Design a protein around this ligand. Sequence first.
Ligand code: EMC
Ligand code: EMC
Length: 253
Amino acid sequence: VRVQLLLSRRPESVSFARSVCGLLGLGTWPIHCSLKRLVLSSRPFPGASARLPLQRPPFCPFAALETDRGVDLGVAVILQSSDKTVLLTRRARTLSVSPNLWVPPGGHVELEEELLDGGLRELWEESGLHLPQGQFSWVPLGLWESAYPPRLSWGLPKYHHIVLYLLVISQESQQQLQARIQPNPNEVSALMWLTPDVAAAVAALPQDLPSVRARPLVLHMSTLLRMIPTMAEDKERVSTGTKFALKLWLQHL
Ligand code: EMC
Ligand code: EMC
């Protein structure tokens, strides 16, 4: 699944090297979009279902520079409990493409699947939370242009995504939710729940509560506030897009 821009009134694919953010404008708002092709435009259009914030990290490789590939599309899910807490997942210790990142569960949008289905699935592929009909609302939060490797300091970029974060707001408690959680060891090595105050801190109490059966873990604010390096390194920290997402979640509240 790819990404197109309505700069005129007739859409076009984006060339990979180009900053989507730049073509539409560190951030731009509101951005009108439809996922059905993700379509983006600074201007409204007949198809569009949401007006969203689009941001890039200050270290974006494409904004710096201003081709057998294109601009992929990812989805990631911010799952809020009845208790106003959100789930994060540390990516599996078992390596390859961004290991030990705390990120919300997410990944490639499939091909022909709707957005909520990509989220709700990716949630399930990682946490094994299946959400029962009528026991959750959802709202799209925003759009985040990213790369692997993250920035010029780590290499020229291979991957180029637009990530759409969803907020899935459950009517169930964290107790009730954590109960029926059954993660996949191969995809995630740790799960945690964030309060607003901890999220507020991460986005902008010295320790928060398993690693993976289920060994308990004390994650230290130090870790959760760790910033991104210049020189590559796979150290346990919270990704820059997740920070954008969590900021957005707080705006929502
Ligand atoms: C020039 C605003 Hg991404
Ligand atoms: C499907 C919300 Hg751009």
